[PDB]
Write an enzyme that holds these catalytic residues in place. Sequence first.
Site, mmCIF file in Angstrom:
data_model
loop_
_atom_site.group_PDB
_atom_site.id
_atom_site.type_symbol
_atom_site.label_atom_id
_atom_site.label_comp_id
_atom_site.label_asym_id
_atom_site.label_seq_id
_atom_site.Cartn_x
_atom_site.Cartn_y
_atom_site.Cartn_z
ATOM 1 N N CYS A 1 0.801 -1.198 0.000
ATOM 2 C CA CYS A 1 0.000 0.000 0.000
ATOM 3 C C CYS A 1 0.830 1.242 0.000
ATOM 4 C CB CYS A 1 -0.866 0.015 1.258
ATOM 5 S SG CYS A 1 -1.916 1.442 1.496
ATOM 6 N N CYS B 1 -0.754 3.854 3.304
ATOM 7 C CA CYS B 1 -1.094 3.245 4.587
ATOM 8 C C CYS B 1 -0.228 3.679 5.725
ATOM 9 C CB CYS B 1 -1.120 1.687 4.445
ATOM 10 S SG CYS B 1 -2.480 1.090 3.489
#
Length: 105
Positions: free
Chosen positions: A29, A32
């Site tokens: 990600c 994140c």
Amino acid sequence: VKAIESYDEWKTLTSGSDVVVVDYWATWCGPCKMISPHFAKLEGKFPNVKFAKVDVEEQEDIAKEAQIKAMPTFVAYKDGKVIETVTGAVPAKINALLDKVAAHH
């Protein structure tokens, strides 16, 4: 923010009558890591909401059931039901989700 470490733990928590917000995240990600501290700040602000996180790369059975479409996704639960899903890492969207969940609690 509780790192959820098994399917059973996840089912126990999301089945509860108390409201829970889960951050679904992964090492693949982008944002994140940048948004995680804001989620932790919200956990201090909202002590009567349960905050949790799931590393989808480590929790395949949870990931299969949650079936997220966006990385990250924040999902709120109550009584074994997904009550609202927020995709992405926009602070205002996550703040608005918590406002509404905390009122529910």
